[PDB]
Amino acid sequence: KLTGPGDKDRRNKRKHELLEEACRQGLPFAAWDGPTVVSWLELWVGMPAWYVAACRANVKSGAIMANLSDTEIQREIGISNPLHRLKLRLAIQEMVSLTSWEQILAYGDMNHEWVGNDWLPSLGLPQYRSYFMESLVDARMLDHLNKKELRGQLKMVDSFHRVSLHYGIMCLKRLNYDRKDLERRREESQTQIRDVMVWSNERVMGWVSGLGLKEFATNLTESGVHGALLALDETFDYSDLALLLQIPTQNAQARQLLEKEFSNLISLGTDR
Amino acid sequence: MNTEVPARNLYAYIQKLTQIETGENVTGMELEFKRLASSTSRFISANLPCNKFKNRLVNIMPYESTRVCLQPIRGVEGSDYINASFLDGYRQQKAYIATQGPLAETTEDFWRMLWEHNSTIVVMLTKLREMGREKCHQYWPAERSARYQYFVVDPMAEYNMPQYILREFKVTDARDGQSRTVRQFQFTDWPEQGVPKSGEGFIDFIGQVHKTKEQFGQDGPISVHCSAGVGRTGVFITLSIVLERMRYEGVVDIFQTVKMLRTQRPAMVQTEDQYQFCYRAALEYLGSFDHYA
Question: What does the domain layout of chain A look like in residue ranges?
């Protein structure tokens, strides 16, 4: 593996120190200069190179950036995608608030790559990864996604899959969007029936397997079944699960077992 | 003969190739490129009379084992065929489709190819016309929406970058209303004769294309085309693989890389100039790291 410094790392470090200096020095976003907003748009927001180049050519200040209309963002930055514009709007508004570092300059701890590579698969929804990432959906955007964007751009036509997202997001809210806390709580509930609200889809499959229903567990892959759904959706019952596990009605013992274990899971690991 | 070289020996290795020694008329580079020749599947679908007009050159056709197949259409023989081949990349299987610049007559096939195989990133390595000849038919709409059989292609935006143009399209399957965004990166800085004087622009372009695939989580193959889909396309794919392998493993083997590509589509990296440029650009990329300059 190639070691040491280089042209790319020098360029990145210098871009970063524009960003770090404005932030640490208490410069409000409106007073940021051109190169600083350009660095910010690349490194902290995570926009592709062509938006960044558009910004560099057409947006000379944070004040300008802050006061762009929707139609002006589309014209000056070239952003066609409504969800990419959402991303920018929320980013600007967050930056304005924080500049008036504790704010993590290790940006992207819950950016669209975390949503895509880590979080959506944990909800049993990995088939939506490409659509969410192409719309650059970060954690900050999740609670702002409206029903039209979910249906159309994000291809979530299935109502159960949308319910699954909803309770995934409710879990994030209850955890105050603390990624470390979510990870810790999943690690500390691996081997006991506890804190079901935080369980991944994989963990749920592990639980089904542990019951002696191992040949059915794999059927929850891409099903949208995860712990926050089991804990927060009062309508989701053992028979809904049995169907998603594709347990035959002829396998009556398996269905009775699931009924009893599911009751135990809810009683011991939730507040339902 | 060992053609795998550690990074720190790459400068010296290239110098030795440029040189001619011990009683041969030709350089080490020329000898190495010719050694690729001695190095296979069959051309079946490509040679069907119903498909002959679908090939830009009669002598460049996909191998059967790696050809990109279209779903057959009722009653139309040859409708499963396009001159295009899958190639594996450094990290994933089917990372690329190598194909010719579309003809007017294969333009609808081209869009169906991107659709059926989930290709949403396209790389164009020529201008439409070069040296008084068509290299590529303009298969994309200019200002308004266009219909290519089942697909409605709507131009979304265009971005002019220093050494390439990015064109974004929305493509809809008119049969069921499903839609995807397709992005085309056209590299605009390849000279109409020879190879680029420096590899830096082409290296950055390779980087941008793969960054886009990663950032937008696009899993499908990158469709790469030039004139016939073997020369410049061969250079793009060779360097894509070699540059990443060099970064993570610290070694370069251009000879075996091209050999490997030619097991998947014939004639990849077609001229000695192109082959030499692979080495030249790898060395330039290496030089962007201080401990190896």
Answer: 1-104, 105-190, 191-272
